[PDB]
Design a protein around this ligand. Sequence first.
Ligand code: HEM
Length: 152
Amino acid sequence: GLSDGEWQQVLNVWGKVEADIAGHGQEVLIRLFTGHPETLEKFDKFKHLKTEAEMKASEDLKKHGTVVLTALGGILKKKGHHEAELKPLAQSHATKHKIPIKYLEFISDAIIHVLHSKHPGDFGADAQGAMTKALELFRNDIAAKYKELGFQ
Ligand code: HEM
């Protein structure tokens, strides 16, 4: 649960992402894959990537970063009223992709890391707090759907 002022911060931060969605999306995925190499194994289309240089050169990885962040941005713009948008993603990630909730924690922390890395000194303490709360809400509502499905 976020206040109006917290949502305002989230959507202000998101404007930084929307100025370069592919560059942010690329770096988020690279931070996830290099920090948590077990996550790469969930992607049949990226498992061939052995080095970070290959990851950086992959145009398909940048494409998938755009898909991921476009979906998250659509959810965030709903300011918590995201049941219809979140349900298919929870279902696909539990039943088809088999993504444990732990990996959604990993990607949430990776988003925070990338924002500080690309905007050092321009991602303030209030903005980090609000973004963290929004990603927690997203993860918590997915977790409720995972429990319904019995997925671990
Ligand atoms: C911010 C969190 C994330 C969002 C919004 C997101 C969004 C999406 C979207 C929109 C798709 C395509 C449609 C679909 O299959 O439902 C997708 C595919 C996928 N997601 Fe996620 N995702 C997230 C996190 C993750 C994480 C943490 C993993 C794995 C560690 C992952 C693994 C996948 C895989 C394996 C695919 C299929 C890729 C392919 O072969 O085309 N997702 N995701």
